[PDB]
């Protein structure tokens, strides 16, 4: 028994709606066009709820939720009715981000800092902002990291079923002011406590316990300095870059460029790659900076470059910091004890795990799968091909964590970015890589392509067969239609990429990912030459590009005659 005192208790609100047949999220969770979630009645507070309700209410009731978004376009919207839905399903406190914003790595380190029950992310990654943009939203849970797939079927089935929710409606935020907004509610005892905090400050103390801040310090000050741009192509990574990397880490203010989170993102893509973060590459082909980088909107994905534009293949970025950990404080006081990447990323960092006698795990593309690996200790490093890394110190991959490993790696080993990329090919030899993107394809004929596909390499004879290209041959070893039983819960994951493995060190992968689709081609062909470890990827690798399209038959079925983008 307690006994408390309110003054205006803001009222509950329980509002009868219908259920929406495509509310189930994907890998990166619920994304639609951003006028569903704007105009579409109900279809926002619909997923809020089913996102609550697939949380036991007696864990619900008086806990913590973690809420930031990457600054696109109705952020603050839909955090605003969040706060007024958390509030009306018992939620005890939210900590949301000064003005709404968090990165998605910070989102991450504060769940689990504070021990939240879990986060929603407000973000579409790569996807444009803006009112005819696209908008998303994600759901992290306890460990900080993606929901899995089991938290997944239990939203969608309140979704397809969800007959009514809860909202207080008369509840208004302030996001602009750090600090508690403590709300009295009806039939709530405590109060309900809104945290606005620093999008930084926590975050940062992770970092700082992480690695050596002098040693980067030094690297990016002095006579000696590294020029530096870093493009937070005005997504949510602004304000880290400038309070990590010029205002701890004492770079430049000119080396921190599109650092005001904006949202349209200024009217371009937030995607780090050398299609779309074309400012960053034309200032780096200048020649006048040892070191560029861009980040996506949400902070968690990173391409980096070298001098003069040299591009660090993210299968590459990978191989290479697995193989220099040992110059970061934090990995050399736990140690490595496993590493991870996706199915398709290049095989670069098995070599590095063969090497180093470290375990290397092969998972489903999506972070989901690696965050077991890392809670059961099986796994400390991991990343994928599409521009993501990251290690336990959270549960999502981590944009900024690439680029202060890497200074860390330069600072320790006195080298720039592609001498320490061409002595690692030196050492171990160079994985060509490359990726085509087939976007917004007919989901039809992506569907027959991929089950045609997947029976010409199961047939009993294809691992008894030879291609031939101009002079290069390539002979089946072997060829899946890819599956994962995860070594922790046991989830089952199938259909995750075809892949045929040829016996002269060389992959192709086949990944089917609006209304359109879009099927991914990957290529691999391993060179251990150190005097062919300059030839350009798409001469490397055309032979087995020519391959692919043939077996495949893409470009007929799609009627494309070249892909959407390659990296
Ligand atoms: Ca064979
Ligand atoms: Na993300
Ligand atoms: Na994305
Ligand atoms: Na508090
Ligand atoms: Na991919
Ligand atoms: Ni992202």
Redesign the pocket.
């Given at each position: 028994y307690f006994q408390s005192m309110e003054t205006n208790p803001i009222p509950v609100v329980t509002v009868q709606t219908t259920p929406f047949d495509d509310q189930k999220p994907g890998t990166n969770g619920l994304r639609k066009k951003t006028t569903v979630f704007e105009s579409k009645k109900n279809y926002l507070q619909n997923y809020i709820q089913s996102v609550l309700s697939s949380i036991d209410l007696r864990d619900r009731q008086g806990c913590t939720m973690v809420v930031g978004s990457d600054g696109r376009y109705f952020s603050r919207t839909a955090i605003e009715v969040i706060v007024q839905m958390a509030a009306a399903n018992g939620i005890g406190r939210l900590v949301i981000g000064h003005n709404g914003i968090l990165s998605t790595p910070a989102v991450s380190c504060i769940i689990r800092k504070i021990k939240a029950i879990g986060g929603i992310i407000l973000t579409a990654s790569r996807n444009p902002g803006g009112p005819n943009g696209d908008f998303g939203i994600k759901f992290n849970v306890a460990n900080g990291g993606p929901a899995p797939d089991t938290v997944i079927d239990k939203i969608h089935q309140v979704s397809r079923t969800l007959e009514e929710y809860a909202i207080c409606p008369d509840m208004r935020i302030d996001l602009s002011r750090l600090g508690r907004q403590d709300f009295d509610l009806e039939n709530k005892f405590k109060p309900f406590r809104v945290e606005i905090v620093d999008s930084v400050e926590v975050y940062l103390n992770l970092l700082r316990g992480i690695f050596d801040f002098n040693a980067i310090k030094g690297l990016l000050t002095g006579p000696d300095q590294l020029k530096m741009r870093v493009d937070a192509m005005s997504g949510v990574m602004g304000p880290y870059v400038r309070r990590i990397l010029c205002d701890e880490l004492g770079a430049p203010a000119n080396s921190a460029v599109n650092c005001v989170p904006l949202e349209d993102f200024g009217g371009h893509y937030p995607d780090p790659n050398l299609t779309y973060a074309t400012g960053l590459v034309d200032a780096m082909k200048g020649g006048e900076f040892g070191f560029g980088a861009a980040f996506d909107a949400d902070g968690d994905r990173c391409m980096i470059l070298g001098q003069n534009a040299f591009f660090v293949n993210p299968s590459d970025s990978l191989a290479v910091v697995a193989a220099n950990l040992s110059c970061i404080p934090y990995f050399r006081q736990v140690g490595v004890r496993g590493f991870a990447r996706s199915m398709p990323t290049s095989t670069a960092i098995d070599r590095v795990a063969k090497a180093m006698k470290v375990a290397v795990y092969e998972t489903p593309a999506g972070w989901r799968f690696f965050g077991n690996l890392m809670d059961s200790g099986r796994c400390s490093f991991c990343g994928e091909e599409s521009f993501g890394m990251g290690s336990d110190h959270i549960r999502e991959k981590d944009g900024l964590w690439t680029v202060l490993v890497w200074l860390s790696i330069m600072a320790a080993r006195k080298q720039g970015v592609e001498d320490i990329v061409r002595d690692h090919w030196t050492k171990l030899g160079r994985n060509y890589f490359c990726r085509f993107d087939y976007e917004a394809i007919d989901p039809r004929a992506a569907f027959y392509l991929m089950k045609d596909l997947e029976a010409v390499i199961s047939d009993k004879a294809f691992?008894?067969?030879?291609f031939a290209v101009g002079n290069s041959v390539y002979?089946?070893?072997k060829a899946d239609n890819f599956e994962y039983i995860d070594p922790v819960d046991g989830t089952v994951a199938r259909n995750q990429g075809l892949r045929i493995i040829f016996?002269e060190s060389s992959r192709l992968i086949f990944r089917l990912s609006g209304v359109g689709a879009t099927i991914r081609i990957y290529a691999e062909s391993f060179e251990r030459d150190p005097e062919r470890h300059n030839r350009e990827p798409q001469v490397v690798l055309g032979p087995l590009i020519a391959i692919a399209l043939k077996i495949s038959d893409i470009h007929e079925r799609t009627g494309r005659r070249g892909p959407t983008v390659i990296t």
């Open positions: 691992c008894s067969q030879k002979s089946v070893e016996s």
